[PDB]
Symmetry: D2
Subunit: 211 residues, 4 copies
Amino acid sequence: MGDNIVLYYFDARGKAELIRLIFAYLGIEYTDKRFGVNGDAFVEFKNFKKEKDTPFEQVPILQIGDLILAQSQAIVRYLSKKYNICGESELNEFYADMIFCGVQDIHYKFNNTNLFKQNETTFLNEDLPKWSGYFEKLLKKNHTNNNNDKYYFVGNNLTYADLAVFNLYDDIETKYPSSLKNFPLLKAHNEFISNLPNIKNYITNRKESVY
Amino acid sequence: MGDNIVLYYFDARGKAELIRLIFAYLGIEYTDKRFGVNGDAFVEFKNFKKEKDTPFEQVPILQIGDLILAQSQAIVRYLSKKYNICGESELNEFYADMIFCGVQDIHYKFNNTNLFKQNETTFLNEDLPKWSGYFEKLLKKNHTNNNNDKYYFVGNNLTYADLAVFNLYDDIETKYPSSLKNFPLLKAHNEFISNLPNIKNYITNRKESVY
Amino acid sequence: MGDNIVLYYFDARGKAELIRLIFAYLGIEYTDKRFGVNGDAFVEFKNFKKEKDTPFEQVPILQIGDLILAQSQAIVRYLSKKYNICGESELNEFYADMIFCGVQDIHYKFNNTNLFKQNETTFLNEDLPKWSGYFEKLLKKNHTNNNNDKYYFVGNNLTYADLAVFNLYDDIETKYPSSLKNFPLLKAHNEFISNLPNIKNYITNRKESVY
Amino acid sequence: MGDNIVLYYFDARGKAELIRLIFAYLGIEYTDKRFGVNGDAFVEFKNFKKEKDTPFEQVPILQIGDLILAQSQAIVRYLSKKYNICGESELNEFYADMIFCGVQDIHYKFNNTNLFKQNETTFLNEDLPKWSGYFEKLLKKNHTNNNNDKYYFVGNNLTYADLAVFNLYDDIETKYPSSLKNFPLLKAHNEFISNLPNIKNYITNRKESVY
């Protein structure tokens, strides 16, 4: 609100990419500060915590004016509620929330998956297909036949849940094969969201990050 | 709303206890259905998923009338927002949310701590004191000197965040020593919340659960 | 020569039970020192580390004379090689080893499973059945000595691998009963081991520990 | 006798690199078979399991002649005992073992650390410094052969324990540089191992793997 917007995080997608996608979709201009660009990523982060008054010594940290906001999920809901992309009814606000909570679950699982731990096949053969099925079924329940051209998990308008699900699979795809092949609506939903003007432009401009 | 309220979960506190505390504090009557009471906990859960249409095949599941709500965090925010215990300003609604997100972090850490994994001393000597410090500092920022008798993390009224922090330490205490000794406000806050009529009565009546 | 043996660990089964089972089987005399029998286990553990020179500040610690041994797996292999329960050939020593490594994987998974984490169903229906099948097949392979009343994983004599598998299911069983119904060889192996006079006498005596 | 040796694993360092380092050190000829060099690594892994009889459906798998060996730790101990790099006494065999067990603990922690999980700072400032100190002290204890240019963790000859510690920091280093600045013995040990002709030649040849 007439205040300089500054997002603080490491030079990576991680837990800040959904926030970035929200700004990109909303056309909100802000300073995307990334650690590890000026100097040692962890030296910068250490000094950051010294200069900024963070509640839990974690990033992302979103600063609006002199207002300091922490916790990625809280930030996402805060921005979504303020910019009306969280549902237009007490029930829909809940559904978008419930879907995001689900996203967090499987997204965490993905980020906890790696060769060293020998849990890659489980994630690929058990966990991902199961959750993809959950999301496929949720998308179907929000009747797509009405206006097929549009794919939304909640109501008839885009919510942060749509961006969260997209970001989930977008992140997974950077490391593992595209499996959406077996989930039509979901596959369609992701294509739809990615091709949105603001989103499509954003993606094309962001640099490739390993994390 | 004029509908029978039914909470479904296992016979344990786990991820459903904050919801139970919310009902207890709000004086809302509901059916507290617990698996493992009528038969094999997992047999019941299996059949439950067959009869109820859950979005992610997880509990807790809160059913209001024929309305099915999943995801503990979403349920907590839904109930809190509806029963006005989530903050009275866009900013305070955010703060209570941010604090709850923090609670989830350390609560997860606690539940991931055990002898077999050899991470007990780290939790007790590093993680818990650090987070207790975060919460102590947050409580202090919400000026307690005003009405010392009252301890709230957000605004001048109770929010679900107050119940979440209480539940966090209440759960930890069941397995590990009371460490709040070094955190006055926090220690005071928990005593205050626990002694609330509805809460105090609830606790005294609930059976002792290992989880 | 005939040094004095002392095992230091918390007052629980955890990672020390396999070592205790080995002693019980071999009929070896030792002092089973447990932290927190009467006081605070962690204050005692803190003092233990200050008084004894441990390599990684972890227990179990086995002291034979003035010799201090650490790392549960290394201790198990040390005792097994010293008291002939490790295999009578290079290949068999390897097989007993390979099996113990497998046990560690699933035993760790079991101890990382809990209600809060919502991974109980996964463990029960995916992970455990899979690993039980691995063990069933390995036992089947070594069936020349599957003698009517004696089952060994390696060769024709008991190895620590046999005690490790027994311990594994013994531990699981105290939380998730009847896991061996569909695995006859494994069930018979468990029965056989649990009925060896020394092991049986030990089990009937040790107290019940939740951990 | 002079069987044909083949190591099967993904096209990455992961849990197979220590075995490869052992072969490199010993100058042993073998086929380093990697999944997904050109195609899909998981389709190839799926086919591998269908074509070869593995005990736990995991890799690495080492085949010598028709002999199939599994479980990385057991394989390392098998090769080390067979090619004399495991210690020349019962006690020293134990010490090399104990050290390797310690390495597994911290190596696993490292591979469980990442931005998404917000546990990087913890690993860097708490865990790694602590474990580096454990190793520094262990190396200091065995300083009768700390000879001007040769450092061994056990006895006066190289053991797999030496290669394991080298591999550990080598892996960490590709993500978190300069971890050995404050640990002179450990740094000197790493330098020494990395400069052995066979090891050096190997390192200069192997390709760069993110995993």
